[PDB]
Homo-oligomer: A and B are copies of this chain.
Amino acid sequence: DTAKGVIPFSTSGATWAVPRLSEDGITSHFLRRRGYVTMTQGGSRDQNAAVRKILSLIIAYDIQTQACFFISNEESMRITMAETMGVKDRPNARTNSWAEVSDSDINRGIAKALKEGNLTLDENQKDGFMKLVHAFVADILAQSGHYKPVTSVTYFSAPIDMESDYLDPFSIAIIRDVLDDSPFSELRYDARAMSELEDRDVPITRFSRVMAQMGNAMVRNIMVLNEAAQRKLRGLAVVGEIVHGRVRYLNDSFIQTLRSNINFHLLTRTTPERWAQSWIQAFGSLKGWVDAINGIADLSDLTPLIRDAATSVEKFVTFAPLSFYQGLGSVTQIRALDSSTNLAAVIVRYAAKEINLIPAYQSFQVPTVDVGVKKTAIMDQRLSLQLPEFSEDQFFGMLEQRMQNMSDSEVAELVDRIAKGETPFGDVVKQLPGTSTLLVTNGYYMGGLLTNEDKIIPGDASVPALLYMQAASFASSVRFPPGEYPVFHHESSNGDVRLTDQVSADAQLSHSAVETANPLNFLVACNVSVHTPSIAIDIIEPMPDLTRRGTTEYVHKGEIKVAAIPSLPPKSADRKAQVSRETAKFERVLYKARKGGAQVAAPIDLESLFGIAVNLAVPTVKHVYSPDSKTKLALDIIKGLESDGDKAAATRLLMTLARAYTGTYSSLDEITGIAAQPSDVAMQEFALQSGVQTLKAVAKHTGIMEVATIEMVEEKVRSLDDNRFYEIAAEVVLRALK
Write the residues of chain A forming the contact surface with B, with a CB cutoff of 8 angstroms: 98, 100, 148, 150, 196, 199-201, 206, 209, 216, 220, 223, 364, 366, 377, 613
Contact = CB atoms under 8 A, between A and B. Distances in A.
Nearest to A366: B216
B364 A196 contact: no
Nearest to A86: B203
Contacts of A201: 98
Contact of A196 (B148, B200, B366, B377): B148
Nearest to A150: B209
Given A150-B209, A209-B150, A364 B220 contact: yes
Given A148-B196, A150-B209, A196-B148, A223 B98 contact: no
Contacts of A196: 100, 148
Nearest to A201: B98
Contacts of A100: 196, 199, 206
Nearest to A219: B364
A562 to B, nearest CB: 15
Contacts of A209: 150
14 contacts: A98-B199, A98-B200, A98-B201, A100-B196, A100-B199, A100-B206, A148-B196, A150-B206, A150-B209, A216-B366, A220-B364, A220-B377, A223-B364, A223-B613
Given A100-B206, A150-B209, A223-B613, 4 more contacts: A98-B201, A100-B199, A148-B196, A223-B364
Closest 5 A-B residue pairs measured CB to CB? A98-B201, A150-B209, A223-B364, A220-B364, A148-B196
Contacts of A150: 206, 209
Contacts of A366: 216
A368 to B, nearest CB: 13
Copies per assembly: 2
Contacts of A364: 220, 223
Contacts of A613: 223
Nearest to A205: B102
Contacts of A199: 98, 100
Nearest to A98: B201
Contacts of A98: 199-201
Contacts of A377: 220
Contacts of A216: 366
A97 to B, nearest CB: 11
Nearest to A203: B100
Contacts of A220: 364, 377
A83 to B, nearest CB: 15
Residue among A100, A199, A200 having the largest count of chain B Cβ atoms under 10 Å = A100
Contacts of A206: 100, 150
A376 to B, nearest CB: 12
Contacts of A200: 98
Contacts of A148: 196
Nearest to A209: B150
A41 to B, nearest CB: 16
A224 to B, nearest CB: 10
A209 B216 CA distance: 37
Residue among A98, A150, A196, A200 having the largest count of chain B Cβ atoms under 10 Å = A150
Nearest to A151: B213
Nearest to A202: B100
A223 B200 CA distance: 45
A378 to B, nearest CB: 12
A202 to B, nearest CB: 8
A102 to B, nearest CB: 8
A617 to B, nearest CB: 14
Nearest to A104: B205
Contacts of A223: 364, 613
